[PDB]
Design a protein around this ligand. Structure first.
Ligand SMILES: Nc1ncnc2c1ncn2[C@@H]1O[C@H](COP(=O)(O)OP(=O)(O)O)[C@@H](O)[C@H]1O
Ligand SMILES: Nc1ncnc2c1ncn2[C@@H]1O[C@H](COP(=O)(O)OP(=O)(O)O)[C@@H](O)[C@H]1O
Ligand SMILES: [Mg+2]
Ligand SMILES: [Mg+2]
Lengths: 106, 540, 525, 49, 98
């Protein structure tokens, strides 16, 4: 592939690898029906900011759960090739679990 | 004598050094000094005809064809479309003299021109320009010391204003408003003394409102110890005169309140519409009632108001004025002793200003109305209201009165005076000549040149009055030498005596000192320039 | 030359190769140096440059003159670059660097013509420069006494020497005392941004003053400002970064109400927010209020009613200087306006300064800053005064960093030339001619001083050479006496690092110019 | 790694005054009032402050 | 960017602020100090905290610079401070260094 991992802390070489070929957007997506956010205080804004990433974090967590279930050791590894982009938040979340991921594949 | 350098290499290869060097021009050495001196001499000779009581005016035309007849040297040089850099330096010198002093903007230019002419003669004789500048600097130091020595102190007390009147008259003698000479002098003195800080502090010129209106006569110009406003009463049926008015200065429009933040008031039922209409009506009624409760007689607003408030004010016997400017609001608050109130909720009787008389004034067959607020208790703001036969004399009177105000301000800052008419110049030239005798030979030429340049003011004054310059100046100098009297000058008005102390020709000492200093440093700066690099592009 | 059917480089490419282009480069450097020759020494003159816009600039500083010249010659631009480098690192001697580099090139031009290999010239320049720098470090006069009075005298003498070449040379003692006093108040870094320089038109040069505090121009006062008192005898200053106006609470804030009572409550809430900020400021005990952000008319009238002073849109640098002088803290929020965050000055006043209104903060005992107020009859007059004071300030700062001085007026360079000639007398001979040429080129500065002063350069140079050979390290050109004199006893003092940097930069520029054999100019895009 | 060697070009004092620093140099100022730290505890945020 | 309120509250707590515009410089600083570029304003944990012997503001020539200096003769990234009298000369020296 003509591209590599976009996270600086990502692993550069995986000996034994499990391949997860996916076409799921792991970056932030806007609602099709022009949602917009309404709040009245800074704490409400913080709660809305934290809760607006729940949808993507659910799929990232599903990937993490699959990773932890397949291999409970550090010997093997997961390479995630995604046809769609991955935002830096999900990239960091995946990197913290020792998963190398690729975005915007052909 | 231009194009900089042009060699194209000893080997025939291109030799390009400076961008667009083939279209640029330069001057070096004594030629640049000669050109600068020529330009400065031309400017000074043009300006020297407008010096003294017999000086003549210059009719200045701008880009758009507007015409300003004026005698102020700073204005004359500011409105000129000069292109020479030395001319721009002369204009900056005049602007500096106007800024620091406010008077003597023409003497500085003539003095600088005479100094540069004498420097031209010295350079032709073969003296380094830096030596000339140093000699001029030390001669200026000697002259300033002599001016300090021969100065006289005057009283700046309100009880006796005669020396102040004489000084203002001396300032206004050369202007066209000398037909009302003592009247303008007195109104300027009273204006400056009214708005001033007693302990020799500054005088704030923005507490003086100088406004002019065409028509009437120049003699009709008067000092109003209050505020004059271009606005009038809002309702045409409101009374045109209020006696013992209790002013209510407000900065909030007489309209329903409106939040600054983006807001939307939702009406969802007929009851909401009824409540909204009732709220608007009650807001109008309550703002009118709040204004009336304080006992005020007049209401002054800055941001205007609508029809319901206007008719409610008329119905409640409350004359009102709208759309008054911020500076005018501040002046009214200062003069009447009231406080600026941001909203009706904070309006109290203690914040109401007091004006003895508020009147609306007509100006003939013009439909124009202007409001007069005067007869204040202890007004700390003053207004000068100028009338004339045409707008041009009105502008000239404005700048002449500004000169008088600046002169009285200088007197307040420092009360030491010297006697004009060229007497101070003659005494300074004599002192410089005496000091030159004790000086070594090399700087003696610079000292003598400085003295000769100082002597140009009496010659200009005598020539402008039709007398023979050299003979009159020599006779006055001889009389000054024979008997100890530094107050002998050029009798421009032909009053029969040369004693300027008796003629009451009085000038501020700091004005003369600033004249000499500024002329000296500008002459030094011009002399130190030995190279010019103009673009030479002749751009459109 | 034969026309190739397919040419190598694009059409219009100009190439010059060999000795002729090196000679042309040397001549270009001479041309650039000639434009700044007369601006050297106490008898130097000023230059006037007019741009395309017609705004003339008048300067005695070499770096400024070179920058205002649109030099496009690739070899000539090196002189401008090294002048800027000398101005950056040292601040004085921007004419000496160019003069020395051009003199080096002129001296080695005859040897370049006769086919001498440029690497030999470069090695000779490097050797001579190292020897000269070592000699300067060795013979620089420093005193190990550690006392305030003589250190201050040294600083004042250095400032006077750096100032005795400009239009303010008549008041050089006064301005040097001002500059030394200004620099001594900077705490540890001697930051230039802590020395304010305000230019006010109109007035004599002697009317210029240095305030032990901070001063800045009045900034667009609103209505009701004239009712505020303009003098305080022990004010507390509330330095702020706060918008004191009626405004939307936030850009993306929308208020939705469906009741007239709620409408009135919202209006009263906006007014209450503004009055709460104002009341907190007032109850903080401060009397003078300054802010980066605008202060509205409502706040101005509120402060006027409390006999307080307000000023909005004060520039960042002015508030920084005010904080350094008074010892407060710029607060973006007014919720905690304690006593330790409020500035304090002995006297605050608004006065008339030459047709303008200026706010004066004086009497600060712990001030780490200052503000120059410069008076003059013209805009360019005050600009050149500011440039001269900048040169003096840089010299004084460098002398604070290290107080090693050498006599000026060409004494140091005459001594260096004598030492270099003595060294060159004891080497095989291929390097001897080049080192002797370097030593001879070191004589340009006294010669230029004599030429600008109108002396006879040859006789003065002969006397200086004889005196230096016989003995006496600090004998230079005496401008006033038409002769030579001991310039150390005449207090013509300049820091040694000025000459060190000048020699280093001139040598590097000369070596870079000599090391080029081809010039290629691609066609302009 | 070749990229681990950084070059900072500062004009004025001749190439003989060059030096090697074990760290990094940024030609920039500081936002706050504090200008020097002796026991630094750098916390790096990629997000706006 | 740095907000005004954040800057004021950092000044209140004696915290030095450095604003690196380029992400490359931020990554290099993270490498040379040993810190992790956090994506939120959360306080750093012990492992993510960066350490340096001395951080200070200084002026070299006429340019204000911020120096991250290690006392030890080791680190992930080392910098070379090039002085000179001409920009082109320093460029040539940089080419030689490369
Ligand atoms: N009544 C007078 N008699 C003699 N000389 C006078 C008289 N009034 C003014 N002068 C002189 O005329 C000169 C020019 O004054 P004026 O034209 O009013 O302003 P400026 O000094 O700007 O030209 C002054 O230097 C003053 O000495
Ligand atoms: N009073 C003096 N007598 C003799 N030489 C002086 C005197 N003051 C300055 N110089 C010399 O004039 C030279 C030029 O200094 P200056 O014109 O101030 O700045 P620059 O070096 O940038 O031209 C200096 O090398 C100094 O040695
Ligand atoms: Mg006059
Ligand atoms: Mg100098």
């Amino acid at each position: 592939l003509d591209h590599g991992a976009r996270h600086p802390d990502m692993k550069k070489r995986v000996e034994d690898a499990y391949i997860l070929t996916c076409n799921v957007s792991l970056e932030y997506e806007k609602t099709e029906v022009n949602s917009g956010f309404f709040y009245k205080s800074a704490e409400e804004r913080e709660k809305l900011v934290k809760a607006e990433r729940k949808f993507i974090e659910d799929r990232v967590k599903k990937i993490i759960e699959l990773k932890r279930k397949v291999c409970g050791d550090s010997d093997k590894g997961f390479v995630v090739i995604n046809q769609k982009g991955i935002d830096p938040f999900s990239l960091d979340a995946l990197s913290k679990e020792g998963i190398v991921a690729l975005r915007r594949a052909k | 004598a231009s194009m900089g350098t042009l060699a194209f290499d000893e080997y025939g290869r291109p030799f390009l050094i400076i961008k667009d060097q083939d279209r640029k021009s330069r001057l070096m050495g004594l030629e640049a000094l000669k050109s600068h001196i020529m330009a400065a001499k031309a400017v000074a000779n043009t300006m020297r005809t407008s010096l003294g009581p017999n000086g003549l005016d210059k009719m200045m035309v701008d880009k758009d064809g507007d015409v300003t007849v004026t005698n102020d040297g700073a204005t004359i040089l500011s409105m000129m479309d000069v292109d020479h850099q030395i001319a721009k330096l002369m204009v900056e010198l005049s602007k500096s003299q106007d800024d620091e002093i406010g008077d003597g903007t023409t003497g500085v230019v003539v003095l600088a021109g005479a100094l540069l002419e004498e420097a031209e003669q010295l350079l032709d004789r073969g003296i380094h320009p830096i030596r000339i500048a140093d000699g001029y600097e030390q001669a200026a130091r000697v002259a300033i010391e002599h001016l300090d020595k021969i100065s006289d102190s005057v009283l700046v007390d309100i009880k006796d204003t005669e020396p102040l009147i004489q000084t203002a008259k001396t300032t206004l003698g050369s202007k066209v408003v000398n037909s009302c000479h003592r009247q303008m002098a007195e109104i300027a003195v009273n204006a400056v003394l009214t708005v001033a800080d007693m302990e020799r502090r500054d005088v704030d010129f923005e507490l003086i409102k100088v406004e002019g209106k065409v028509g009437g006569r120049l003699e009709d110009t008067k000092l109003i110890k209050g505020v004059i406003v271009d606005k009038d009463f809002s309702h045409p049926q409101m009374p045109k005169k209020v006696e013992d008015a209790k002013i209510a200065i407000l900065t909030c429009p007489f309209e329903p309140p409106k939040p600054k933040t983006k807001h939307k008031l939702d009406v969802t039922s007929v009851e909401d519409y009824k409540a909204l209409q009732k709220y608007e009506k009650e807001k109008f009624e309550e703002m009118i009632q709040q204004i009336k409760e304080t006992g005020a007689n007049l209401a002054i607003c800055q941001w205007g108001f609508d029809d319901e408030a206007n008719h409610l004010l008329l119905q409640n016997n409350l004359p009102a004025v709208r759309w008054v400017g911020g500076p005018e609001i501040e002046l009214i608050a200062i003069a009447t002793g009231g406080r600026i109130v941001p909203r009706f909720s904070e309006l109290t009787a203690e914040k109401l200003g007091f004006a003895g008389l508020v009147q609306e004034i007509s100006f003939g067959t013009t439909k124009d109305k202007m409001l007069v607020i005067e007869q204040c208790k202890n007004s700390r703001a003053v207004t000068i209201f100028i009338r004339g036969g045409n707008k041009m004399i009105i502008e000239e009177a404005k700048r002449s009165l500004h000169d008088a105000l600046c002169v009285i301000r200088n007197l307040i800052r420092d009360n030491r005076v010297v006697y004009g008419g060229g007497a101070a110049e003659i005494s300074c030239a004599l002192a410089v000549s005496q000091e030159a005798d004790k000086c070594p030979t090399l700087e003696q030429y610079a000292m003598r040149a400085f003295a000769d340049a100082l002597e140009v003011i009496p010659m200009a004054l005598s020539e402008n009055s039709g007398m023979n310059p050299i003979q009159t100046m020599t006779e006055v100098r001889a009389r000054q030498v024979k008997e100890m009297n530094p107050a002998l000058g050029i009798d421009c008005l032909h009053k029969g005596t040369n004693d300027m102390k008796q003629q009451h020709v009085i000038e501020t000492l700091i004005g003369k000192k600033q004249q000499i200093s500024l002329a000296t440093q500008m002459v030094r700066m011009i002399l130190k320039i030995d190279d010019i690099r103009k673009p030479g592009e002749s751009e459109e | 030359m034969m026309p190739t059917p397919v040419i190598l480089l694009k059409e219009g490419t100009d190439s010059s190769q060999g000795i002729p282009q090196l000679v042309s480069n040397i001549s270009a450097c001479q041309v650039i140096a000639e434009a700044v020759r007369t601006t050297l020494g106490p008898r130097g003159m000023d230059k006037l440059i007019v741009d395309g816009r017609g705004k003339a600039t008048i300067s005695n500083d070499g770096a400024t003159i070179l920058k205002l010249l649109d030099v496009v010659h690739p070899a000539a631009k090196t002189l401008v670059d090294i002048a800027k480098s000398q101005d950056a690192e040292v601040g004085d001697g921007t004419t000496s660097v160019t003069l020395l580099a051009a003199e080096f090139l002129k001296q080695v031009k005859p040897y370049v013509e006769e086919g001498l290999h440029p690497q030999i010239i470069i090695r000779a320049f490097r050797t001579a420069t190292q020897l000269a720098v070592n000699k300067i470090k060795e013979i620089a006069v420093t005193v190990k006494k550690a006392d305030k009075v003589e250190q201050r005298k040294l600083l004042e003498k250095c400032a006077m020497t750096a100032l005795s070449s400009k239009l303010i040379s008549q008041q050089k003692a006064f301005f040097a005392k001002m500059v030394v006093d200004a620099v001594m108040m900077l705490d540890d870094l001697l930051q230039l941004k802590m020395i304010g320089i305000k230019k006010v038109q109109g007035g004599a040069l002697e009317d210029s003053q240095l305030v032990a505090g901070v001063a800045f121009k009045k900034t667009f006062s609103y209505a009701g400002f004239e009712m505020q008192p303009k003098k305080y005898h022990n004010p507390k200053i509330a330095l702020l970064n706060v918008e004191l106006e009626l405004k939307a609470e936030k850009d993306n804030a929308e208020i939705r109400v469906h009741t007239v009572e709620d409408y009135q409550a919202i209006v009263d809430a906006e007014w209450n927010i503004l009055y709460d900020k104002l009341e907190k400021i007032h109850h903080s005990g401060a009397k003078v209020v300054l802010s980066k952000l605008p202060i509205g008319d409502v706040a101005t009238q509120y402060f006027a009613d409390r006999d307080m002073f307000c000023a909005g849109r004060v520039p960042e640098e002015d508030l920084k200087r005010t904080m350094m002088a008074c010892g407060g803290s710029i607060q973006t929020s007014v919720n905690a306006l304690s006593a330790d965050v409020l500035g304090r000055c002995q006297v605050f006043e608004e006065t008339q300064i030459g047709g303008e209104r200026y706010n004066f903060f004086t009497g600060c005992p712990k001030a780490k800053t200052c503000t120059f107020i410069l008076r003059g009859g013209a805009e360019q007059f005050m600009e050149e005064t500011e440039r001269s004071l900048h040169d003096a300030i840089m010299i004084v700062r460098r002398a604070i960093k290290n107080d090693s001085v050498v006599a000026g007026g060409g004494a140091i360079e005459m001594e260096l030339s004598k030492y270099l000639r003595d060294y060159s007398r004891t080497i095989p001979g291929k390097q001897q001619l080049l080192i002797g040429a370097y030593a001879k080129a070191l004589e340009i500065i006294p010669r230029q001083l004599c030429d600008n002063a109108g002396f006879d350069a040859t006789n003065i140079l002969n006397k200086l050479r004889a005196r230096h050979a016989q003995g006496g390290t600090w004998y230079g050109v005496d401008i006033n006496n038409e002769d030579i004199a001991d310039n150390f006893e005449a207090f013509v003092w300049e820091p040694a690092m000025v000459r060190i940097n000048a020699l280093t930069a001139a040598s590097e520029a000369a070596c870079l110019i000599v090391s080029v054999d081809e010039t290629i100019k691609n066609p302009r895009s | 790694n070749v990229d681990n060697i950084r070059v900072c070009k500062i004009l004025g004092s001749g190439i003989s005054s060059s030096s090697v620093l074990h760290g990094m140099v940024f030609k920039k100022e500081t936002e706050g009032d504090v200008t020097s730290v002796k026991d630094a505890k750098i916390a790096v945020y990629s997000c706006p402050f | 960017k740095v907000a005004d309120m954040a800057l004021h509250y950092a000044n209140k707590y004696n915290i030095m602020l450095v604003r690196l515009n380029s992400k490359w410089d931020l990554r290099r600083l993270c490498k040379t100090v040993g810190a992790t570029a956090l994506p939120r304003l959360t306080p750093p944990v012990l492992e993510e905290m960066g350490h340096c012997d001395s951080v200070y503001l200084s002026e070299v020539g006429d340019t204000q610079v911020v120096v991250f200096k290690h006392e030890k003769e080791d680190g992930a990234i080392s910098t070379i401070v090039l002085r000179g009298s001409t920009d082109n000369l320093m460029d040539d020296i940089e080419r030689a260094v490369d």
